[PDB]
Point group: D2
Chain length 254, copies 4
């Protein structure tokens, strides 16, 4: 039960976003939620999607995590509007398709660095600013993919960005542990989202999970959301620096 808790959820674009799965679970459990977005179009979808939740009010903030000033001023404004928070769900990544759909060895410098910036460094800075609203401690979750742990076909520059993200969770866990702030990752199996359309071969990845993964089915956004609830709540006290695979067991087989 999450009444009297407040979570910031970053990275909803539409109803298929993984962070909307998180939102529904946390809302169902009585949490107060605050949302962040980059594009106008995403604020618009948030304004619509809120009509399905129980949030008595829209708490929406534009934060493009490429900008320090936006991350810093964003969280400062959230603190002024709703007070201290209990956690952050981070559901944000980006890379160019021009890099993704080429050979990994042909990745450009600007594109490799773009992916690191949005997909990994953004957690470091978000945690830094979020820490200020968690003086009694709290919980931070980021979303990763098994391509951070192994070389998967076509995932390419994003796989290197996710490896970087998973180490970021571990170094943040260590840094922020004494402040009673836990930092963890969920490694989600493939789910049809707007961003999935950038991963070449995506339907093939879905089919391989059904045919090979222990549970012989794909996961969805609500399943990622239920494990987020566990990680953002006191149910997972003691658990930090961990990568929980919500992927029908695919990580465990070869």
């Amino acid at each position: 039960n999450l009444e009297n808790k407040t979570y910031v959820i970053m990275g909803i674009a539409n109803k298929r976003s993984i962070a909307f799965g998180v939102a529904k679970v946390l809302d169902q459990l009585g949490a107060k939620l605050v949302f962040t977005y980059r594009k106008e179009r995403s604020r618009k979808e948030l304004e619509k999607l809120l009509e399905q939740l129980n949030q008595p009010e829209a708490h929406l903030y534009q934060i493009d995590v490429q900008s320090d000033e936006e991350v810093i001023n964003g969280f400062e404004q959230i603190g002024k509007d709703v007070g201290n928070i209990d956690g952050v769900y981070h559901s944000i990544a980006f890379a160019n398709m021009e890099d993704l759909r080429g050979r990994f060895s042909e990745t450009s410098r600007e594109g490799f660095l773009l992916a690191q910036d949005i997909s990994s460094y953004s957690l470091t800075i978000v945690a830094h600013e979020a820490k200020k609203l968690m003086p009694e401690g709290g919980s931070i979750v980021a979303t990763t993919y098994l391509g951070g742990e192994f070389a998967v076909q076509n995932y390419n520059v994003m796989g290197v960005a996710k490896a970087s993200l998973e180490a970021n969770v571990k170094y943040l866990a260590l840094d922020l542990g004494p402040d009673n702030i836990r930092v963890n990752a969920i490694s989600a199996g493939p789910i049809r989202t707007l961003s999935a359309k950038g991963v070449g071969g995506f339907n093939t990845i879905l089919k391989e999970i059904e045919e090979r993964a222990p549970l012989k089915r794909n996961v969805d956004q609500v399943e990622v959301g239920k494990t987020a609830a566990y990680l953002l709540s006191d149910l997972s006290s003691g658990v930090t620096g961990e990568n929980i695979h919500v992927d029908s067991g695919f990580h465990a087989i070869k």
Copy 2:
């Protein structure tokens, strides 16, 4: 919320057992619980301990996991007394004391095979017998230790038994996944228990966590029990073949 769930908890020795932590938590959450014990000092005991739970009956079964008959007939009888169950917590391990200190290279064949038998194979047979009481699926959790993933001083033969136990979980996840049975582990940090006494140099292990783990503190039986409630329930539906460290982040640092 676990009202109308039933869980078999194996491995309570006394008020300090990790499995009793698990029991208080599932009991608080409204589960019907069933308990197995090895021998008749644990029983007398057990009976007294359960006045602290809201269990309105005492369902207790002797099962020494070294005997097929006892496991086969114990789950059979459980099945007859309470019907289908929703999951199994396995909290059971053993090795000879001489082996948990001094030199791993001097371990006896008998001592090595005894630790494998009780600490690893017992999950395979308990799984096979429990599956019979879970026609619509369910959840199996075992308790391991970092010494199954890394060589740790003194833990010696039990570390090889936990390596084996951790694979056991993965192979059972693969096998039982189509039957909708999830199989996972919780890698607990060190906890002062009756069995901890037999681990060479336990007190130093304890202190190392406080000094070096991200949370700078040790965990307890109830923090294990909370992650057990997660893994035993539908919050973790997308999760199988997994090992969750409830160890203050220790597993993530070096």
Copy 3:
């Protein structure tokens, strides 16, 4: 790499396809003196034939069934008397019963699970304890494992749990014996057609998966395992212990 004036015990040659025969060819070619141990007289007869291919001036052949403490103990002690001190051991030994290597893992019998642990894991422990007696200036023990020890692979079943156990055994041995200057390491070999692979269900589809999906897009062979064994058993790998090197065309690194 030159291994003249080194001496290596190789355990688990059955025939010309054995992984340990790849190791033997490579070590022998590098000038090492080799001692071979076998379980069945048929393997000894095979060893006698296979030696005529190697440069070894003599046959050092010992029957050691690793289920027997006395055979391991008396075998290594006899080896010490015939050749003196050794430089390392290549361990290439596993077993489980047929029925535990296809279909369903949850149905594994206690007897079959413990058999597999006994031969495929505990053997390395007692071998190392006895071999250590012949390595007073230090040396190098290598065991052979498979990717099924790290992940659940279809059909591998009880052997996978045996390999997990082997891989932790290597780590505990490494820690225990490091101060004696004995390194202990594993080679995680890719799938290779051998007599014992006839026991793994779906083995042909395993090979074919490697060709299609592994970074090098081809299978490995026994000599490539023997080349990494030469590195591990020699002074090139000083510093390296508790380590599991995958000779498998990259397959462990991909999903």
Copy 4:
């Protein structure tokens, strides 16, 4: 091994304590022709002097700042015209600001994080791309990493995240270049006293902890890394790619 008529590019020698210099000595002793790349004009001066300890009859020194594509592109092209085709590249390059290193990880600057990614991880990718043009029959590329890429190590901070990225870069390149018969691997070296180690807070307690706790109970040295490099760069390691070999006295394997 046996590396005559092989040619390797070694990137990242600054002085006699550099890890890459340990690679150079081992490879040079094994008969390789070596080509050296540097950033600072002062590192070139050290090379010219370190080269008298070596059997290289010719000094092949090239300035390449891996921050600049132009420099990596023109550098390898020039190498190709001066020495023809090469057999492999040893990459020993990393960098991050002190000011980011010696602050709390959570206080890392965006610009210092991207700097460490750019020099210590991206550089392998572009190096691999340009070096492929000089390896039409295949070859081997080895990068240097540290345990702090796999676990959160006190003080290593932004470099830990750059090494994690570098270890993944290795696996993705292994996959991409495998069909070209180019293997790409990492060595995970234990702590070694070098100029760059001065940047790591608590470096001397890291050394002491290896001596007290690692299976071998001693630290490793640059030559030990060089010897595993010789294996990885040569045909002994055929079949090995996407791999991370810990040259660290076993420390990776214990907790």
